[PDB]
Design a binder for this molecule. Sequence first.
Ligand SMILES: [Zn+2]
Lengths: 50, 50, 150, 88, 357
Amino acid sequence: FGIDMNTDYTLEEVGKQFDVTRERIRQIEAKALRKLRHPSRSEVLRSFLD
Amino acid sequence: TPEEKLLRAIFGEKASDVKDSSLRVPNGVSGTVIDVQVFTRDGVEKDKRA
Amino acid sequence: VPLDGGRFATSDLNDLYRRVINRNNRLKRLLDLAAPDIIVRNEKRMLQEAVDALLDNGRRGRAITGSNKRPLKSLADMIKGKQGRFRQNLLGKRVDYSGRSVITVGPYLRLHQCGLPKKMALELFKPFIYGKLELRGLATTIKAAKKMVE
Amino acid sequence: TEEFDAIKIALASPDMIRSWSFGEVKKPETINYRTFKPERDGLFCARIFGPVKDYECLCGKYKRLKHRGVICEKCGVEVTQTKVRRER
Amino acid sequence: IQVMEEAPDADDLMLAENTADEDAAEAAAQVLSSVESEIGRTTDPVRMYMREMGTVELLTREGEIDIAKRIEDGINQVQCSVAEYPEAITYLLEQYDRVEAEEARLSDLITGFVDDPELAREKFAELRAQYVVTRDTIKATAQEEILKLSEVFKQFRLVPKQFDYLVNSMRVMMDRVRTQERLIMKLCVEQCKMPKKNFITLFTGNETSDTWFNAAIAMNKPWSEKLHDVSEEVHRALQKLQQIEEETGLTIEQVKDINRRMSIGEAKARRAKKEMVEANLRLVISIAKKYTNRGLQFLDLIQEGNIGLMKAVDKFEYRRGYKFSTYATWWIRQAITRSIADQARTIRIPVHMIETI
DNA sequence: TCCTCTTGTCAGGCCGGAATAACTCCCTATAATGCG
DNA sequence: AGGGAGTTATTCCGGCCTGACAAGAGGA
Ligand SMILES: [Zn+2]
């Protein structure tokens, strides 16, 4: 995404900047998303929903 | 803006394409609905209440 | 700007500019055609008319609008008002955080205070309320503070 | 915002008038009446005055904020804040 | 002052506004002069234009046919003048072949001759033959044969655009000739200090041969000796002019003849059209009165009518035997309608939609 | 046992023909002629 | 008094092309 930076880079370009460009990076994105689903981390944004 | 996209991803926030306009009662007015009238133009499909 | 319902509203400058540009373009074409002097001269008169109406309308034949009878408001008129600056001078720049209501006696008051209705104070001081509500943490974010005031 | 003083008044020379202006308005048209997008290069013109809607060009090629100084090759409108349309 | 309806009074306040209107009293002088001359202060453009048209009286019927003959005569004069230099038929045949070779279209070059595609093809065959024979026969006789080729070429009528393009190609070649000659005589008279009377005597007549060149250098003047400092440039311009006349080929006096006759013909035709338009301005305004109230100004309408009248005049044919006014009416009304339709609405609307509304 | 790496098929953006709008060249032939 | 033939632009349906998401198996 673009959080704190200009244009957002897609999977392949982000992997290039890590030099590891493959399914593992999207899987890392998905694991972060899933683990952040759990409340106490989400409660602040859970209420922050509108 | 990006962070909203992040939040939409996280919580599963399916964006509804329709804005709200409904006629709410003015501030500080309280009474009984005494009557209702409905004016539909010829052609359009009247609704149950009409 | 579009009025609701399809109808449009525009300032008179749009019309004045249209007239200026139209006469200018027609003069260009008349020049390219090598028309007789009389017609080019009439066109130069028309352009003078249009420009001088545009800058300050009212020192000539008062060029009215299409079918609306009131003289169109030119730049000079837009600047000059009563007194002069309409919005810069009286009156008078509407302001936020203001309220008004009917006055009542209230003898029990001390000399240096005044009775102010609750709901006016809530409306005025909304943002102060939000700040204090969030400082104590009673509300997670500003949206919940608004809901809590509602 | 500058901290200024001394406001100077003088007759505008033709080269200064050219200096402030960003483009020439050749046709008197205002808007397309069917699709209310502005006409080029009419009294209301996006390539001269500014983009109608924030950070999105006229023809709709560029809509991301990541583009801000690019000037769409089809429509010569730069992608920037709509507020600029109040000062050009 | 600003007195009210019928001069009331109260109100000790008229001196603040009396002071609020300044010492500088030119006005006093202005009013005095103006109201002491009784020159009609006709500010409204309507009146002044009304007078301007009022000056030109009504050019009756037979005057109109007269000026139509003069217009035709001017156009024919310029057409003959074009016929007379061997670089105009080259491009003709080039675009005729373009059309025939199928690199162009049969309706892009001609719109009917004067006294069928078969006939055009054969006349251009015989034109090619006569042209090539008269070019070979260049070495008196060649001038007479060029005259005869031009007399056969009179037959042709070119599409208006082509007539404009040919007058423009000949205009630009004459532009090169005139600019080269002017710059050569400028450099000479101004840098070589060439006395302008002897300039006339020796330089005038040819402007192409070196006889005046070598007589001036033989004239032993000190600027004549500097003449070599820029002899390369000057003599190169003289040579280039000579080559231009080698593709002209005839001489250096018939260029003069042709340009002067074209100017004369054009001026005649222009003056005749001028006559017609000022005579029919009243007609234009008469037709204008109908459309005044479609949210356009009066004078814009009369101007659109003037443009329509110019076009009508330019396209009018008297030989049809009908009066001019009736024919011009059609173009004046069409033009007025088109302009009112187009410049009327703020959000301009196509003309068919206006007609449907 | 838990965490990580692999093959494959759907989805969304893009280009070609088509079809409804617009803009210019044909517009014309009894005569009509100052007016706001 | 608006009739039009021809042309180009612009939206729209039909079809091509590259990212992205799912399910399982293998390694530390
Ligand atoms: Zn664009």
